[PDB]
Design a protein around this ligand. Sequence first.
Ligand SMILES: O=[N+]([O-])c1ccc2nn[nH]c2c1
Length: 301
Amino acid sequence: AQSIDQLIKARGKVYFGVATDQNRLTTGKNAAIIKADFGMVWPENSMQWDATEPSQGNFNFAGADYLVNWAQQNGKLIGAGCLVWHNFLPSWVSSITDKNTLINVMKNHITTLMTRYKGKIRTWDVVGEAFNEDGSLRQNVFLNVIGEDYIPIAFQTARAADPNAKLYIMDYNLDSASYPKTQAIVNRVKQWRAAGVPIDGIGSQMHLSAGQGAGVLQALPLLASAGTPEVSILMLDVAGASPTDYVNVVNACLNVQSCVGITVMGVADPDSAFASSTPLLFDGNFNPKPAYNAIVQDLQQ
Ligand SMILES: O=[N+]([O-])c1ccc2nn[nH]c2c1
C-alpha cells in the first residue's frame, strides 16, 4: 500500500489530507493523486471571506461548491475555513467600527457558510491567526472592534450552524513548546473551554523551515494539553522536504492520541507558493519524493 491516507487510517488516525481547489483539480495530475493518496480535502481559497462574501450579505459559492461537490463525488472528507481571520478579509469588513455591526456581520458569515454544507463538513476552522508572537491576542478588526468576546461568539455561532462539525482554532508558529505563542494558545483555550466556548480542536499551521520537525514532538502534546477533543496539523510543508522533518511531524501526531490527522499544503512542488523550496511530497513530475516514501515506511506495519 502506497496511499499515506490509507496507511495513517490503518494506524488509527482519521485522515491524511491536502489543500486544493477547483483550479487545481482541473489541471495537472492533482485530482488523480488526491483520489489515490489523500482522504480529506480543504479549499485553499474558495471558502475564505473575500471569495464567499465580497459585499455585505451577498454570498457566492462557485468555487466552494465545486470543491465540496468534488469531495462528495470522490468519497473524500472535507475541512473548510477560515471563517474569522485577518487574511482574505474584504475591506468592507475591516472598515466596520462598531461592535454590534461586526458581531452580526461575523455571525451571518459563519452561519451562512456552515449552513450551506450542514452535515457534510468534518472540520471548520472557525478562528485563525488570533495570536501575536508574544502570546497576546492579535489586534485584527475583530479584536479591535468586538473585543475578546469575538472568539466565544464565533464558536457558539458555529456550533449552532452545524453541530456535526468539529470546530477549530488555528495558528502558525506553534512549533516549539518553549515559544510564548504555543503556551499562550493553550492557556487561552483552556480558559475559553472552561467559559463554555465550544473549541473542539487546535490546528497547528505547519509551514516549516528545515529542521523544525523535531520541535513538533513536544509542541504538539503541549497543544493537546489545552483539553480540546482534537488537535490537527494543517498547511504542512517543509523547506527542502527532508524525510527527517516529515517523519518527525508524522511521529508527533502518532504520539498524540488526540491528533486526528495531517493536511499538506498542496500536491506537487511547482504548484506550491514556496515552489523553489521544493517543500511538498510530490515533485513536478508528480512522482512521490523521498519524504513521501519515508512517511509510507513510517506508517506501514
Ligand atoms: O490545512 N490547510 O492546508 C488549510 C488551508 C486553508 C485553510 N483555510 N482554513 N483552514 C485551512 C486549512
